[PDB]
Amino acid sequence: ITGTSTVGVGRGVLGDQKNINTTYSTYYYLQDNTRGDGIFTYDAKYRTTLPGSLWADADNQFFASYDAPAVDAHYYAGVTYDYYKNVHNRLSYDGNNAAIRSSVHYSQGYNNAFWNGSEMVYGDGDGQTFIPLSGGIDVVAHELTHAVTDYTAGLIYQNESGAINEAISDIFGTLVEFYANKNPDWEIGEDVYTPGISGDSLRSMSDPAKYGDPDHYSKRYTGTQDNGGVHINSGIINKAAYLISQGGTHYGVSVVGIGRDKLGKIFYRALTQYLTPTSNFSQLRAAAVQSATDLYGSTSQEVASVKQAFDAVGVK
Ligand SMILES: [Ca+2]
Ligand SMILES: [Ca+2]
Ligand SMILES: [Ca+2]
Ligand SMILES: [Ca+2]
Ligand SMILES: [Zn+2]
């Protein structure tokens, strides 16, 4: 909508107060003019027709419990935008400042969040398995990272390329959580998962096996469920990325950790320069090795650590 850029205030899903960039034209809309060609948040009104209505508010105050999911979707989209721009020199998901659109209040009791090819969509959860999913910065950044992948490598969402596509989103979702630096960790979705249970999440990158996911190639899922195990076999790549960053000895193989910033550089470069729609795990290892070589040199610690990390998870 055409109008002036304004600044509202509200509470997110977890009760935290924050400012949001809005736009004024009769009503105050969830439209942030300060990033690229805009970030726009819509209300799906418990339906599944998308996008819904651009979020409109009478007073620029967003403290109602109904407001909370939209506050977070909008705000964490902005944080994710800032991460790609400031860290990777990437302007929005297409690299050309595409508008970022999100809808909240999708369906009723919907325990999930996803990128539908054009926009973000967040359920409210059923209050037991999930609370509104946009309250998780790693969830927001995970799903926005699928948009980045769709415009770059184009990793097909099935089997190994699919598990890489998933891992890439867990990796950058986690790096975005560390960037924002509020209770960061190497698990996925903990802030919105199971309000009654402390310390759990959907997935762990540091120990995929915690939730039954493989942490080694010899444990790969080879069946047909979950598009050939895209959320299952990602554990193997997640563990490798965790090792590259933090270090550790995994099945007898020692890895020297090089830290989060370098992990982010190597994997962004693999994503955007080397990976293709059909890349398998072994091809990911070669892309990551070539990326680390471009960035730090062929004899570097960084290259040696990438090789050790993939050795540790059985990927040659
Ligand atoms: Ca209001
Ligand atoms: Ca966290
Ligand atoms: Ca997390
Ligand atoms: Ca929980
Ligand atoms: Zn995903």
Curated annotation (Swiss-Prot):
Stretches that traverse the bilayer: none
Broad enzyme group: hydrolase
Temperature dependence: Thermostable.
Entry EC number(s): 3.4.24.27
The keyword Protease appears for this protein: yes
Main location group: secreted
Positions bound to Zn(2+): 142, 146, 166
Subcellular location: Secreted
Any one cellular-component term (Gene Ontology): extracellular region
Residue positions binding Ca(2+) 2: 138, 177, 185, 187, 190
Residues annotated to bind Ca(2+) 1: 57, 59, 61
Name of the protein this chain belongs to: Thermolysin
Gene name, Swiss-Prot/TrEMBL: npr
